[PDB]
Each structure stands twice: as structure tokens, then as C-alpha cells.
Amino acid sequence: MENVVSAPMPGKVLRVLVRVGDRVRVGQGLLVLEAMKMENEIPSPRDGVVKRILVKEGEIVDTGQPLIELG
Numbered sequence: 009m010e011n012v013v014s015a016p017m018p019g020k021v022l023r024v025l026v027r028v029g030d031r032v033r034v035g036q037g038l039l040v041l042e043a044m045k046m047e048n049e050i051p052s053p054r055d056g057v058v059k060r061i062l063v064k065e066g067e068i069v070d071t072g073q074p075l076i077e078l079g
Contacts, residue, residue, distance in 0.1 A: 010053035013076040015069040019043035024065055026076075030058045043070055047075070050075065 037049030
């Protein structure tokens with residue numbers, strides 16, 4: 009049971025697609041992570057509510073780094 013969206017690889021947080029409190033669906037893109045001339049939509053692992061967004065747009069993140077917590 010997944011509660012935290014973490015970075016699958018290092019990247020730059022290009023865009024955060026949802027806000028705290030928003031309802032989300034499994035497989036929905038929640039943010040866009042840029043890496044190696046590619047824009048990766050990072051999905052919600054489950055239906056739920058966005059509780060916390062732990063990064064800002066522009067931020068560089070490393071592998072496994074927490075990005076979003078679901079409530």
C-alpha cells in the first residue's frame with residue numbers, strides 16, 4: 009500500500025500538476041520530472057487525496073526522494 013510518491017530517478021521538478029487537498033486517481037500524472045531530454049509524468053500509485061507536496065517546481069531531486077504524500 010503506497011502512500012508516498014518518490015522520484016524514480018534523479019531529475020528536475022518541471023511542474024507540479026495537483027495541489028494539496030486534491031483528489032487523485034491511480035495512474036494520474038501528479039508532476040513532471042525532467043531527465044535526459046525527457047519529460048516523465050510521475051503517477052499517483054493509488055486513488056486518494058494529496059496531503060503534502062514536498063518539493064517545488066525547479067527543484068533538483070535524487071532517486072527515491074519523497075515528492076508527494078497521499079493522505
